[PDB]
Amino acid sequence: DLPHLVNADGQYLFCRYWKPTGTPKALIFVSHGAGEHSGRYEELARMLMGLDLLVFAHDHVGHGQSEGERMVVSDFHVFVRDVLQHVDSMQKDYPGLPVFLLGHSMGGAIAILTAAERPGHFAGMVLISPLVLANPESATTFKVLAAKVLNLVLPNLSLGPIDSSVLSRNKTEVDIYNSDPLICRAGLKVCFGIQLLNAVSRVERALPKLTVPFLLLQGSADRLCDSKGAYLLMELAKSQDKTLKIYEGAYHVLHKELPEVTNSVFHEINMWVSQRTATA
Amino acid sequence: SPRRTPQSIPYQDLPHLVNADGQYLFCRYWKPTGTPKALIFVSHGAGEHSGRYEELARMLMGLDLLVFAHDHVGHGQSEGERMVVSDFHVFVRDVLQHVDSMQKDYPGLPVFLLGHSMGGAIAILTAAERPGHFAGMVLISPLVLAKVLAAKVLNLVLPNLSLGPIDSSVLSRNKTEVDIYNSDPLICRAGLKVCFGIQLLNAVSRVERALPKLTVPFLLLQGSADRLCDSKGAYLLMELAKSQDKTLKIYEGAYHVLHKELPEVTNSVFHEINMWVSQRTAT
Ligand SMILES: *C(=O)N1C[C@@H]2[C@H](C1)[C@@H]2c1ccn(-c2ccc(F)cc2)n1
Ligand SMILES: *C(=O)N1C[C@@H]2[C@H](C1)[C@H]2c1ccn(-c2ccc(F)cc2)n1
Numbered sequence: 001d002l003p004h005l006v007n008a009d010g011q012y013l014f015c016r017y018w019k020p021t022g023t024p025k026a027l028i029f030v031s032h033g034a035g036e037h038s039g040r041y042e043e044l045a046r047m048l049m050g051l052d053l054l055v056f057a058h059d060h061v062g063h064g065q066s067e068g069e070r071m072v073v074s075d076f077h078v079f080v081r082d083v084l085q086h087v088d089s090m091q092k093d094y095p096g097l098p099v100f101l102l103g104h105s106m107g108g109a110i111a112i113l114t115a116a117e118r119p120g121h122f123a124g125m126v127l128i129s130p131l132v133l134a135n136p137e138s139a140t141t142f143k144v145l146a147a148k149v150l151n152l153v154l155p156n157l158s159l160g161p162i163d164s165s166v167l168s169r170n171k172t173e174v175d176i177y178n179s180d181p182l183i184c185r186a187g188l189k190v191c192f193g194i195q196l197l198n199a200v201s202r203v204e205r206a207l208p209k210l211t212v213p214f215l216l217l218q219g220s221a222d223r224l225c226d227s228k229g230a231y232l233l234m235e236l237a238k239s240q241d242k243t244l245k246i247y248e249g250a251y252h253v254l255h256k257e258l259p260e261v262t263n264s265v266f267h268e269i270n271m272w273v274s275q276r277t278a279t280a
Numbered sequence: 281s282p283r284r285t286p287q288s289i290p291y292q293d294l295p296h297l298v299n300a301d302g303q304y305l306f307c308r309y310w311k312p313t314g315t316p317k318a319l320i321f322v323s324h325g326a327g328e329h330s331g332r333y334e335e336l337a338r339m340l341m342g343l344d345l346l347v348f349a350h351d352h353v354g355h356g357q358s359e360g361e362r363m364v365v366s367d368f369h370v371f372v373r374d375v376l377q378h379v380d381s382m383q384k385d386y387p388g389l390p391v392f393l394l395g396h397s398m399g400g401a402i403a404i405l406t407a408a409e410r411p412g413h414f415a416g417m418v419l420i421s422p423l424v425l426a427k428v429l430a431a432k433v434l435n436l437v438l439p440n441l442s443l444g445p446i447d448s449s450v451l452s453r454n455k456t457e458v459d460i461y462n463s464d465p466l467i468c469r470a471g472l473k474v475c476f477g478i479q480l481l482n483a484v485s486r487v488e489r490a491l492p493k494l495t496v497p498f499l500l501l502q503g504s505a506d507r508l509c510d511s512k513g514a515y516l517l518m519e520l521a522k523s524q525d526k527t528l529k530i531y532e533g534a535y536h537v538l539h540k541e542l543p544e545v546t547n548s549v550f551h552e553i554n555m556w557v558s559q560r561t562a563t
Contacts (some may be wrong), residue, residue: 220519231515234530235504240544244528246518260524271555 002065005058005089007082009074013058014038014065015086018045024054026098026123026277027090031083031114032057033105033131034196035071035184037064044102044255047266051274054094058086060110064182071184072156076195076202079106080113087114098123098280100273101212104255105225106131109199116206124241124276125214126269128254129222133229134200144197150190158187166223166251173256207233213241215272217265219250219257243272285357287465294357297350297381299374301366305350306330306357307378310337316346318390318415318561319382323375323406324349325397325423326480327363327468329356336394336539339550343558346386350378352402356466363468368479368486371398372405379406390415392557396539397509398423401483408490416525416560417498418553420538421506425513426484431474442471450507450535457540491517497525499556501549503534503541527556 003015016030016038028048030041038057045055060079062068073079087099100123103111108130115122137143150157164174164185177183188196214237218230227246234244245268247254250261257265282290283304295307308322308330320340322333330349337347352371354360365371379391392415395403400422407414435441448458448469461467472480498521502514511530518528529552531538534545541549 227519231519234528235511235515238532240532241548242530242532244518244530246526246528248522248524248526264525271559275555 005086007061007078007085009061009078011061011067013061013067013082016045016057018049018055020049020052020054022052024094024097025052026054026100026273026280027094028053028055028100028102028273029083029087030055030057031101031103031107031110032060032063033107034188034192035063037182039064039182040180040256044266044269047270048273051270051277053100053273053277054090056086056090058082060107063184070186071192072189073192073195076199077113079110080117083110083114084117098277100124100126100276102126102128102269103130104128105252106196106199108132109203112203112206112210113199115212116210119209119211122212123280124273125212126272127214127216127233128265129218129225129252130216130229130233131196131199131225132203132233133226134197135226139197139200147190147194147197151194155189155191157190159190159193161185161187162224168251168253168257169249170256170258170262173253177253177256207236208238210237211239213276214239214243215268216242216244217247217254217268218244219247219252219254219261221249222252224252283359286359286362287357289357297378299353299370299377301353301370303353303359305353305359305374308337308349310341310347312341312344312346314344316386316389317344318346318392318557319379319386320345320347320392320394320557321375321379322347322349323393323395323399323402324352324355325399326472326476327355329466331356331466332464332540336550336553339554340557343554343561345392345557345561346382346389348378348382350374355468362470363473363476365476365479368483369405371402372409375402375406376409390561390563392416392418392560394418394420394553395422396420397536398480398483400424401487404487404494405483405490407496408494411493411495414496415563416557417496418556419498419500419517420549421502421509421536422500422513422517423480423483423509424487424517425510426481428474428477428481432478435474439475441474443474443477445469445471446508452535452537452541453533454540454542454546457537460540488520491520492522494521495523497560498523498527499552500526500528501531501538501552502528503531503536503538503545505533506536508536
């Protein structure tokens with residue numbers, strides 16, 4: 001019924017496309033964060049489509065309108081494999097077009113790992129508060145063994161839900177988040193918590209070989225992805241073209257923050273992609 | 281006899297200004313053909329002078345900005361004992377004097393600051409002294425991160441006490457630019473004097489205290505392999521400044537003088553400044 005793709009595990013992934021009227025100048029894959037879905041990138045995608053980019057996305061397995069037990073994954077690499085499947089199909093239909101990646105939170109870790117798996121393949125990456133660092137209190141050998149032990153008996157045990165007020169200072173956007181039926185607001189399950197720790201460990205190992213151009217957007221008051229991880233990404237990535245923008249006092253969901261922040265975010269992505277699309 | 285530059289040119293033959301201490305500062309102007317859209321002050325680094333910003337200034341003048349500069353006291357064609365200053369604030373006071381004179385002649389125009397190394401610390405302190413006054417600041421490897429006090433009282437018995445001259449190869453990976461640096465007679469290549477090193481430590485301490493009140497928009501350009509201004513200081517400036525509009529660009533493997541680095545770096549530096557100032561000049 002709906003636009004979709006069938007992944008290597010035989011699971012249906014819901015697909016979304018924002019095709020410009022004329023010939024596309026470039027392709028851009030949108031990778032959403034944990035618990036959310038591709039429908040939340042409607043405004044960003046419309047802005048990008050207005051630059052003559054063909055925007056495409058899928059809801060990651062266990063998210064939005066895609067199949068899978070909610071916010072569970074056999075191995076974090078499944079997300080990367082599925083992005084590469086979708087990118088490869090699009091590129092076959094649009095040969096020679098440059099391909100960009102845009103990712104938020106966990107979607108940002110997926111984008112990093114996707115570009116690290118295919119060096120020199122992506123024209124650029126836009127990262128909005130990417131998941132790159134674990135809280136040191138949750139990554140100790142003791143806490144990892146405790147989580148692994150707990151995983152054996154109660155893999156679906158919830159770590160408790162977050163206070164949705166840490167997502168954005170924009171109260172209306174918090175209320176939109178809280179009433180979207182496609183968002184999973186249930187607490188992080190132990191088994192998925194371990195997969196996010198695998199994602200952070202894999203990101204850290206990938207940075208010395210990451211050469212893709214990137215734009216990194218980060219809020220200074222983000223309680224989910226600490227701003228210190230954005231500074232470490234700027235320092236450790238080997239990319240020759242890297243830009244960081246810090247939004248003072250902003251929370252996690254920068255593209256759904258206070259209008260002053262959101263307008264700047266859209267403008268900065270517009271300018272950065274536009275400058276690297278003319279280059280093609 | 282008429283007052284002359286340290287290189288014996290009468291100041292009456294050159295654009296100049298006289299600072300609050302009665303010292304002549306050599307001035308430089310790059311005025312666009314038509315009506316200027318904005319003003320931009322260029323603040324040079326320690327040991328160098330305003331003549332090294334010729335190319336950057338021509339690019340900015342091409343955006344219809346009126347570019348202006350002076351050689352800091354004790355530098356280039358200005359007066360004063362070489363690379364010595366009574367207090368670091370003298371540099372800030374003199375920038376404000378020049379900015380205030382230009383603004384009187386061009387009322388209502390937005391004013392930007394562009395600074396490299398010590399010139400960047402001057403730009404930060406200048407904007408911190410006048411909140412909401414400057415439209416923006418472009419910083420190229422600014423000086424933000426650091427018992428020579430014994431040597432300060434030992435600079436009463438040994439005034440010329442210096443730290444070793446730096447290895448010019450550390451400034452840029454571009455060998456031609458290193459050779460240009462080494463043969464410019466207006467550059468002071470002598471090692472950093474202890475009394476001046478203390479003033480640079482005062483600058484860094486004052487920059488740290490100014491950051492919680494710094495709100496000016498800024499663009500920060502920094503090389504990852506800079507041995508003079510460690511890249512760590514650029515990350516700390518991004519974190520501690522209260523500015524709502526702040527952008528950092530890191531040049532992987534680049535040295536200190538980014539605007540005179542390898543062509544791939546220099547071309548990006550010029551382009552990024554062009555785009556950043558242009559977007560804030562349209563306003
Ligand atoms: C920029 O204008 N610079 C002047 C030359 C290079 C950077 C060096 C410099 C600036 C500040 N300091 C300094 C030295 C020691 C110390 F403990 C603090 C500051 N050196
Ligand atoms: C992005 O999609 N992210 C950002 C980061 C995980 C997914 C989210 C995060 C950080 C900390 N926690 C968390 C969840 C539940 C809990 F009880 C305590 C911390 N989720």
